Amino acid sequence: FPSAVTIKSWVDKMQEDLVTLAKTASGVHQLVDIYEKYQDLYTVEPNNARQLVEIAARDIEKLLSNRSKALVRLALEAEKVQAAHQWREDFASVVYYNAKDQRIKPVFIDDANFRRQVSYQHAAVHIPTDIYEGSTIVLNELNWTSALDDVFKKNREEDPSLLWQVFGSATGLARYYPASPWVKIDLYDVRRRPWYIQGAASPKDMLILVDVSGSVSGLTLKLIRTSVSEMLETLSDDDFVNVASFNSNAQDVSCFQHLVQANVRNKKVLKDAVNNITAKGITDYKKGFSFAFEQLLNYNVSRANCNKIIMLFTDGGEERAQEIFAKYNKDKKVRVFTFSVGQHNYDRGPIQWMACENKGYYYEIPSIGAIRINTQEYLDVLGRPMVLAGDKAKQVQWTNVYLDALELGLVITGTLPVFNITGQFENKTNLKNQLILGVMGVDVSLEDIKRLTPRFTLCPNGYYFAIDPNGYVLLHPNLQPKPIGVGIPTINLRKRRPNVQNPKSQEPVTLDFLDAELENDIKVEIRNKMIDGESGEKTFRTLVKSQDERYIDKGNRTYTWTPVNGTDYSSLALVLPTYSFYYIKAKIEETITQARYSETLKPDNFEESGYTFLAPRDYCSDLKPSDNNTEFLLNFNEFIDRKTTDLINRVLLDAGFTNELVQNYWSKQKNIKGVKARFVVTDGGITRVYPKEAGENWQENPETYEDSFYKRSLDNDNYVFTAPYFNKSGPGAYESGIMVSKAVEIYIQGKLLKPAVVGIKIDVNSWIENFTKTSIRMDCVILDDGGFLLMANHDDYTNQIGRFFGEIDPSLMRHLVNISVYAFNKSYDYQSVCEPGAASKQSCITEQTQYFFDNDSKSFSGVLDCGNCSRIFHVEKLMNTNLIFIMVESKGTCPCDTRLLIQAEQTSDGPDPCDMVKQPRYRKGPDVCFDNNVLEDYTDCX
Ligand SMILES: *[C@@H]1O[C@H](CO)[C@@H](O[C@@H]2O[C@H](CO)[C@@H](O[C@@H]3O[C@H](CO)[C@@H](O)[C@H](O)[C@H]3NC(C)=O)[C@H](O)[C@H]2NC(C)=O)[C@H](O)[C@H]1NC(C)=O
Ligand SMILES: *[C@@H]1O[C@H](CO)[C@@H](O[C@@H]2O[C@H](CO)[C@@H](O[C@@H]3O[C@H](CO)[C@@H](O)[C@H](O)[C@@H]3O)[C@H](O)[C@H]2NC(C)=O)[C@H](O)[C@H]1NC(C)=O
Ligand SMILES: *[C@@H]1O[C@H](CO)[C@@H](O[C@@H]2O[C@H](CO)[C@@H](O[C@@H]3O[C@H](CO)[C@@H](O)[C@H](O)[C@@H]3O)[C@H](O)[C@H]2NC(C)=O)[C@H](O)[C@H]1NC(C)=O
Ligand SMILES: *[C@@H]1O[C@H](CO)[C@@H](O[C@@H]2O[C@H](CO)[C@@H](O)[C@H](O)[C@H]2NC(C)=O)[C@H](O)[C@H]1NC(C)=O
Ligand SMILES: *[C@@H]1O[C@H](CO)[C@@H](O[C@@H]2O[C@H](CO)[C@@H](O)[C@H](O)[C@H]2NC(C)=O)[C@H](O)[C@H]1NC(C)=O
Ligand SMILES: *[C@@H]1O[C@H](CO)[C@@H](O[C@@H]2O[C@H](CO)[C@@H](O)[C@H](O)[C@H]2NC(C)=O)[C@H](O)[C@H]1NC(C)=O
Ligand SMILES: *[C@@H]1O[C@H](CO)[C@@H](O[C@@H]2O[C@H](CO)[C@@H](O)[C@H](O)[C@H]2NC(C)=O)[C@H](O)[C@H]1NC(C)=O
Ligand SMILES: *[C@@H]1O[C@H](CO)[C@@H](O)[C@H](O)[C@H]1NC(C)=O
Ligand SMILES: *[C@@H]1O[C@H](CO)[C@@H](O)[C@H](O)[C@H]1NC(C)=O
Ligand SMILES: *[C@@H]1O[C@H](CO)[C@@H](O)[C@H](O)[C@H]1NC(C)=O
Ligand SMILES: *[C@@H]1O[C@H](CO)[C@@H](O)[C@H](O)[C@H]1NC(C)=O
Ligand SMILES: *[C@@H]1O[C@H](CO)[C@@H](O)[C@H](O)[C@H]1NC(C)=O
Ligand SMILES: *[C@@H]1O[C@H](CO)[C@@H](O)[C@H](O)[C@H]1NC(C)=O
Ligand SMILES: *[C@@H]1O[C@H](CO)[C@@H](O)[C@H](O)[C@H]1NC(C)=O
Ligand SMILES: [Ca+2]
């Protein structure tokens, strides 16, 4: 039973230790004087936030205008060549490429924009392996499409760095220049690609009715459970659905009861509802359709207000529901596509009738295999209103982000339909002009937009970002490839085969603005203002998740936004802290001075300067080191010695200042008693570790803007203690020790600049030795921001260093959150890969529970009562630093091993989507839309 004055005097002894050891060993107060002394070699220039945003909006506008324009050239030529064709029937005269293996076998160049072998002299062709022998529908369309060869080749010379041009086509071919070898079974139908089903129709309020009566059971039900799952893959993220069965009565076997958004997530609820359909009852078709036309009302919701589709997966029946379409379809504004599946011997008579009265189109499905071809030809009917406005339907329609099939990265496509002009201005009988040919696509990699958005003048905390009218993400730096979505991934191994590659999931990567950052009632008000807003900034105190999900910091974010002045399929946001409005412009003028700076950077001097490491960056002719930063550093010296424009000027100025911490403050100390290894990480990407012997175990990412502790120490105005991983793979441990950090504030003529982070990596053993000799002059735990053990007595805990305290003594920690200090948050990360459960690596949703300090008052006294043992806590925060000191009495007396508070990530389901739809997230759909011309002429279907 200790006493509070004696404890607080003893905490203030450990406070004055770790602070004074930090100020002496790190050259923090010495390095400011280095930055103060050289008042020259600067002109500190502002960022201005705004002026950055309007300039970077004009380049993202011109990039989508430069490539977009090319689309018009491919659409104008493709149609021109299509008029003069004359339909050859025999083919004894053609020579294309067939990229899956007369034909061509050309030369290949290893090229680096494509990261792959390209040709530049031919287009390649992908004919899906369901189709082909020479069948003169395919073979004739290789004829006129060969003309687009000159115009594909034209646009590389007009503007380089174009990625894949592509003409998709309604018969399934793809010509794409540059020609390249296509990447056991290759499924890949181009007509079901999100970039085709997007610019091939207008958005869609679908409603799927599924006959679940007693007559569908058997084969013809199993084809409906497959075909709805193959139907819903043809929906973009502007399209809405619902799935409704009918039988005796009617019901929306989905758990939604109205129309939903057809996200990645909301389509998964439907694929578990459809796969648990039972089959029993009596068909009636009158309680069914009258439930279908009510759902396509409900204006209450927030539908898209466009092509209304009722799709029908019945088997058969003798019921023309004539009393219903006269009730609801007098104005003929609901297209009804009807499918009739399986090999039932029923009456297909009425089902053909329902679709040819209601501008529909009857389809038929014999078996599995016809499912992929039939449920995509339903978009040729929806293109019928678009072709009748061919002067003004050629807008450009950009697709929201998805992974390329050729292995390029995240790419965004621009699409434009190509329509059949073969009589026009002469007009003509005009027989089948009411169908499109295909869609021209032009890719942009998001790296090419990131080339436009420089992330190296703003503090590593600052970053650009961009939101598309459905409230999803182009440039938030928390995206990364790998698909996202859905929940706990159950795979049984008791069902698979020694066979097929388990297909590649054409799903797009749609991250929500509320699920990249932390959800807050201000950032909602930002997004709903940013999604259509004209201009606005807001400065506020938020929770900022740290880059590795250990920690939560609290800082001031001043961010602003503006729309793209051209297209409206994006709007940008430059994000800046309050201490990053001013940056350092390098300005070096003597040419001897920067020559001496280059001397320092050579690897010959690591005994004198130490282990210097130089972050991978951009210039003319270099690469990305695969951990061989030594190879990058030698290549970088070859850049200087050939030189004997601002990144090259900054790093040379940065090395010259981090030199004078070594040769003037660390060379005069020479292996201090304590510490373990001094380190300096700056922006400019020069991280130096002084001794170089155990500094080879510096296991951190040398790119400083991706670096996990550099960003944290800029926010806090004091010492930050990081706690290392436990086991981690390897020796970061006792062998490594724990770290200290403090950013470096600079006082130029009334301004605030924080360029550098200076740190110490504390020896674990020597700081044990003070900690126990101070106690002779009881169960003590040093515990940081986040519940991680830094050190402790009792020596069963020192085998744990860095493990979260909830897996040590949870009864303290479940208590300690319940009395404030420390609170938490729980966010979701949609892209974390984990292992599949029970019934190798794939994507899943993980929870992330991150603990952090709440109030002030660094004195928390209180008593814990579990039962029949009680014990007394004295929780004391150390001042001017990031630490809690806890005095807990006697593990010893009887335990309470109830459970564990567990950090790290746990595989979980998402939020409840049945409740998430109720009050959904504000959004705005496009404005065009095309439906119901007077002409049309519906006399096909059949
Ligand atoms: C915990 O262990 C540390 C060793 O890793 C000890 O740190 C050293 O303590 C010395 C005295 O406490 C300091 O000496 C002082 O150094 C300054 C500048 O170097 C001189 O101006 C002072 O004259 C000198 N003191 C005297 C009496 O001459 C060491 O600088 C210091 N090491 C560092 C890196 O700061 C801690 O003392 C030890 N904790 C306790 C409570 O003993
Ligand atoms: C599609 O393929 C056909 C052939 O499979 C191409 O037709 C060919 O077109 C060229 C020029 O239009 C013809 O050349 C002509 O030759 C005659 C003599 O034979 C000459 O008098 C003309 O001055 C002209 O040079 C060629 O004969 C013709 N081939 C056939 C079999 O008729 C057509 O060009 C292809 N389409 C595209 C867009 O490339
Ligand atoms: C663009 O639309 C036009 C319609 O104006 C399409 O032209 C027609 O295409 C069909 C293809 O089935 C041709 O039918 C074929 O005619 C030959 C006679 O030479 C016959 O032997 C075949 O059995 C078949 O019936 C039709 O002739 C043709 N119309 C004309 C005036 O030539 C054209 O196909 C569309 N473009 C594309 C790429 O689909
Ligand atoms: C959405 O639809 C519901 C129907 O479920 C509407 O609720 C009806 O509102 C009228 C108002 O004229 C009342 O007379 C009815 O009694 C309501 N129905 C029920 C079952 O109570 C609702 O008004 C619609 N609009 C909104 C915004 O919710
Ligand atoms: C596109 O951006 C331009 C400027 O880049 C905007 O022009 C502004 O026009 C308003 C009034 O219409 C003026 O008050 C501003 O001074 C103009 N801005 C500039 C830069 O001078 C234009 O408004 C933008 N387009 C739209 C549709 O808002
Ligand atoms: C990264 O690249 C450098 C090349 O400069 C490697 O350094 C050489 O490594 C080999 C094998 O370990 C040694 O035999 C040489 O003596 C090293 N120096 C030179 C100048 O060749 C370094 O080992 C590479 N790192 C990794 C992890 O592969
Ligand atoms: C994330 O943590 C913040 C910590 O501030 C939570 O915000 C506080 O929540 C409590 C209880 O909900 C309120 O009493 C406080 O007034 C809130 N403070 C502020 C500034 O809003 C927030 O609720 C947490 N969010 C989640 C999803 O856990
Ligand atoms: C726009 O296109 C022209 C045409 O080649 C090109 O020179 C220019 O660099 C493009 N703009 C940008 C920002 O790349
Ligand atoms: C139907 O299947 C779904 C998905 O597995 C499940 O949630 C639901 O409980 C099932 N219903 C019945 C009656 O088995
Ligand atoms: C935001 O700025 C104010 C004024 O400069 C400062 O006092 C405050 O500490 C900052 N907020 C945080 C969370 O640090
Ligand atoms: C990780 O550390 C825990 C200590 O709780 C230990 O039980 C486990 O075996 C370690 N794993 C590896 C791979 O070393
Ligand atoms: C923990 O917090 C909850 C929520 O405020 C409260 O109901 C409960 O009483 C607290 N626990 C104790 C032991 O007071
Ligand atoms: C923060 O929590 C502690 C818990 O004891 C309390 O003493 C302190 O007053 C709280 N601060 C505020 C501002 O409520
Ligand atoms: C605590 O006391 C109860 C009776 O009040 C007794 O039955 C129980 O065994 C005791 N448990 C411990 C752990 O002391
Ligand atoms: Ca039936």
Give 173-224 as a DSSP string.
-EEESS-----------GGG-TTTSSTTS--EEEEEEEE-STTS-SHHHHHH
The dihedral built from the CA positions of residue 827, 828, 833 and 839, taken in this order, carries a sign that is: positive
Query: CA–CA separation, 507 vs 229, rounded Å?
Result: 13
Q: Position 560: which residue type? A: T
Return d(Cα 915, Cα 931) in angstroms, integer.
Answer: 32
Q: Are 34 and 661 a contacting pair, CB within 8 Å?
A: yes
Q: Rounded CA gap, 452 and 73, in Å?
A: 25
Candidate from 11, 12, 16, 24 with most ligand 1 atoms within 8 A of CB, to mutate: 24
Dihedral sign from CA coordinates of 649, 654, 657, 660: negative
C-alpha torsion sign, points 596, 599, 600, 605: negative
Q: Give distance in angstroms: CA of 138 to centre of ligand 3.
A: 13
Angle of the 4-25 helix axis to the 764-773 helix axis, nearest 10: 150
Question: Residue 211 annotated as binding?
Answer: yes
CB count within 10 Å of CB 286 equals 16
Interatomic CA distance for residues 195 and 440, integer angstroms? 9
Q: Please state, in angstroms and rounded to a whole number, the distance separating the CA atoms of residues 595 and 601.
A: 10
- b/e sequence 202-221, b meaning 16+ C-beta within 10 Å: bbbbbbbbbbbbebbeeebb
CA 369 to mean position of chain CA atoms: 33
Q: Tally Cβ neighbours within 10 Å of residue 178.
A: 25
Beta-bridge partners for 716: none
Report CA(608)–ligand 6 centroid distance (Å): 21
> Number of H helices and number of E strands within the chain?
23, 37
3-state secondary structure of 453: coil
Instruction: Give the residue whose CA is nearest to atom 14 of ligand 8.
Output: 63
Q: Does any ligand 10 atom lie closer than 6 A to the CB of residue 146?
A: no
CA pseudo-torsion sign 183, 186, 187, 189:
positive
Distances (CA, A) of 507 to 61, 491, 565: 27, 19, 30
* 240 vs 340: CA distance, rounded Å: 23
Count CB-CB contacts under 10 A for residue 772: 11
CB 554 less than 6 A from any atom of ligand 10:
yes
Burial of 237 (0-12, 13-18, 19+ CB in 10 A): buried
Tokens of 636: 């970088």
What would you measure as the largest C-alpha separation in the chain, in angstroms? Answer: 106
Instruction: Please give all residues whose beta carbon lies within 6 A of any atom in ligand 2, as ranges.
Output: 81, 88, 93-94, 143-144, 146-147
Using DSSP, state whether 776 is helix, strand or coil. coil
**Which H or E run contains 528?**
helix 523-530
Q: What distance in Å separates the CA atoms of residue 706 and residue 725, rounded to the nearest whole number?
A: 18
Burial of 916 (0-12, 13-18, 19+ CB in 10 A): middle
Which ligand is closest to the CA of 563, given by its number?
5
Q: Which two tokens stand for residue 756?
A: 């550098």
Among positive and negative, which fits the CA dihedral 144, 150, 154, 160? positive
> If you take atom 5 of ligand 7, which residue's CA is the nearest one?
854
Burial 616-638 (b: 16+ CB within 10 A, else e): ebeeeeeeebeeebeebbeebee
Say whether the peptide bond before residue 597 is cis (omega within 30 degrees of 0).
no
**CA 100, CA 127: separation in Å to the nearest integer?**
8
The reply to whether ligand 3 has any atom less than 6 angstroms from the CB of 84 is no
Q: Within 10 Å of residue 877's Cβ, how many Cβ atoms?
A: 21
Q: How far apart are CA 695 and CA 610, in angstroms?
A: 9
826 lines ligand 7 (CB under 6 A): yes
User: Which amino acid is it at 21?
Assistant: L
d(CA 481, CA 479): 7
Contact 550/726 with Cβ under 8 angstroms? no
Task: Collect all residues with Cβ–Cβ distance below 8 Å to 478 and sequence separation of at least 6.
Answer: 511, 516, 517
Q: Calculate the alpha carbon distances from 669 to 605, 664, 674 in Å.
A: 18, 9, 12
Nearest to 597 by CA among 36, 38, 23, 33: 38
Question: 3-state secondary structure string, 459-498?
Answer: CCCCECCEEECCCEECCCCCCCCCCCCCCCCCCCCCCCCC
Residues having CB closer than 6 A to ligand 8 are: 59, 62-63, 66, 158-159
Q: Are 457 and 420 contacting, i.e. CB atoms less than 8 angstroms apart? A: no
Ligand nearest 567 Cα, by number?
Answer: 5
Beta strands in 43-177 (DSSP E): 45-46, 109-111, 116-118, 124-126, 165-168, 174-176
Nearest atom in ligand 10 to the alpha carbon of residue 717 is 14
| Three-state DSSP class for residue 545 | strand
What is the per-residue DSSP string for 555-578? EEEEEEEEE-SS-SS-EEEEEEET
Count the Cβ atoms, other than its own, within 10 Å of residue 892. Answer: 11
Angle between helices 219-231 and 266-273 (to 10 degrees): 180
CA of 536 to the centre of ligand 5 (A): 14
Nearest partner of 665 among 18, 20, 28, 37, judged by Cα: 28
User: What is the DSSP annotation of 245-298?
Assistant: EESSSEE-TTT-SS-----TTHHHHHHHHGGG----S---SHHHHHHHHHHT--
Q: How far apart are the CA of 699 and the centre of ligand 6, in A?
A: 17
* Residue identifier of the C-alpha nearest atom 1 of ligand 11: 727
Q: Is 554 in the pocket of ligand 7 (CB under 6 A)?
A: no
Q: Which atom of ligand 7 is nearest to the CA of 552?
A: 2
Find, among 145, 635, 28, 811, the residue nearest to 437 by Cα. Answer: 145
Ligand 13 interacting residues, C-beta cut-off 6 A: 819-821, 855, 857, 860
Q: How far apart are the C-alpha atoms of 130 and 310, rounded to whole Å?
A: 29
For ligand 2, atom 32, which residue shows the shortest CA distance? Answer: 93
Residues 634, 836: Cα–Cα separation, whole Å: 44
d(CA 569, CA 50): 20
CA 505, 510, 512, 515 dihedral sign is positive
Secondary structure (3-state) at 914: helix
Name every residue whose Cβ is closer than 8 Å to that of residue 331 and which is 6 or more positions away in sequence: none
Measured CA to CA, the distance from residue 289 to residue 285 in angstroms comes to 6
Distance 680 CA to ligand 10 centre (A): 26
DSSP letter at 229 equals H
Say if ligand 10 is within 6 A of residue 556 CB.
yes
Q: Which helix (H) or strand (E) holds 359?
A: none
CB 169 within 8 A of CB 131: no
Contact predicate 941/356, CB 8 Å: yes
Range list of H helices, 366-440: 371-374, 379-382, 384-387
Ligand 1 contacts (CB < 6 A) are 17, 20-21, 24-25, 672-674, 766, 770
The closest alpha carbon to 310, from 231, 236, 386, belongs to 231
Task: Give the number of the atom of ligand 9 that is nearest the alpha carbon of residue 275.
Answer: 2
CA separation, residue 176 to residues 116, 124, 149, 407, 442 (Å)? 14, 6, 9, 14, 10
Under DSSP, is residue 312 helix (H, G, I), strand (E, B) or coil?
Answer: strand
Task: Write down the residue that tokens 């309050």 correspond to.
Answer: 578
Q: How far is the CA of 57 from the centre of ligand 5 (A)?
A: 13
Query: Which helix or strand (DSSP H or E) is residue 855 part of?
Result: none
What is the 8-class DSSP label of residue 664? I
Q: What span, in angstroms and rounded, lies between the C-alpha atoms of 102 and 98?
A: 10
Joined tokens for residue 320: 């023309």
Question: In the beta sheet, which residues pair with residue 210?
Answer: 245
Nearest Cα neighbor of 742 from 716, 762, 764 is: 716
Segment holding 231, helix H or strand E: helix 219-231
Instruction: Spell out which residues have Cβ within 5 A of ligand 15, the ion.
Output: 213, 215, 283, 317
Instruction: Give the phi and the psi of residue 683 in degrees, each rounded to 5.
Output: -95, 140
Pairing assessment for the beta strands 472-473 and 467-468 based on DSSP bridges: antiparallel
Q: Look at the block and give the residue holding tokens 């406005």.
A: 389
Q: Point out the ligand nearest to the CA of residue 752.
A: 10
- For residues 182 and 54, give the distance between their C-alpha atoms in angstroms, rounded to a whole number: 40
SS (H, E, C) 600-620: HCCHHHCCCCCEEEECCCCCC
CA 209 to CA 228: how far, in whole Å?
10
Nearest CA to ligand 1 atom 8: 21
Per the structure block, which two tokens stand in for 545? 């998740």
Cα–Cα distance for residue pair 743/716, rounded to 1 Å: 8
Helix (H, G, I), strand (E, B) or coil at 552: strand
Q: What value, to the nearest 5°, has the Cα angle with vertex 799 and ends 796 and 804?
A: 95
Angle CA 115–120–121, to nearest 5: 150
What span, in angstroms and rounded, lies between the C-alpha atoms of 22 and 738?
Answer: 13
Strands 307-314, 204-211: pairing is: parallel
Classify residue 547 by burial, with Cβ atoms within 10 Å: 0-12, 13-18, 19+. buried
**3-state secondary structure string, 694-732?**
HHHHCCCCCCCCCCCCHHHHHHCCCECCECCCCCCCCCC
CA dist list (Å): 390 to 81, 305, 386, 432: 17, 22, 7, 15
In 3D space, the residue among 593, 613, 576, 616 whose CA is nearest the CA of residue 465 turns out to be 576
- Residue found by looking up tokens 């008579």 in the block: 349
By the 10 Å C-beta count (0-12 exposed, 13-18 middle, 19+ buried), 138 is classed as: middle
DSSP 234: G
Q: How many CB atoms lie within 10 A of CB 27?
A: 23
Q: Which segments of 50-131 does DSSP mark as H helices, in order?
A: 50-83
Measured CA to CA, the distance from residue 224 to residue 276 in angstroms comes to 11
- Of 547, 877, 585, the closest CA to residue 713 belongs to 547
Q: What dihedral angle (degrees, nearest 10) is formed by the CA atoms of 612, 618, 620, 622?
A: 50
User: Among candidates 129, 132, 151, 152, which has minimal Cα distance to 141?
Assistant: 132
How far does residue 904's CA lie from ligand 11's centre (Å)? 14
Q: How far apart are CA 538 and CA 454, in angstroms?
A: 22
> Facing residues of 124 across strands?
176
| Token output for 446 | 């998001």
Q: Which ligand is nearest to the CA of 137?
A: 3
DSSP 436: E
Q: Find the 80 Cα to ligand 8 centroid distance in Å.
A: 27
Amino acid at 865: D
Two structure tokens written together for 247: 């039988």
Tokens representing 835 are 């292992």
Residue 821, classed as helix, strand or coil, is: coil
Residue 244 near residue 252 (C-beta atoms within 8 A): yes
For CA atoms 283, 285, 291, 297, the dihedral sign is: positive
Helix (H) or strand (E) holding 689: strand 686-689
Residue of 9, 16, 20, 678 best suited for mutating to test ligand 1, as the one with most atoms within 8 Å of CB: 20
Residue nearest to atom 2 of ligand 2 (CA): 143
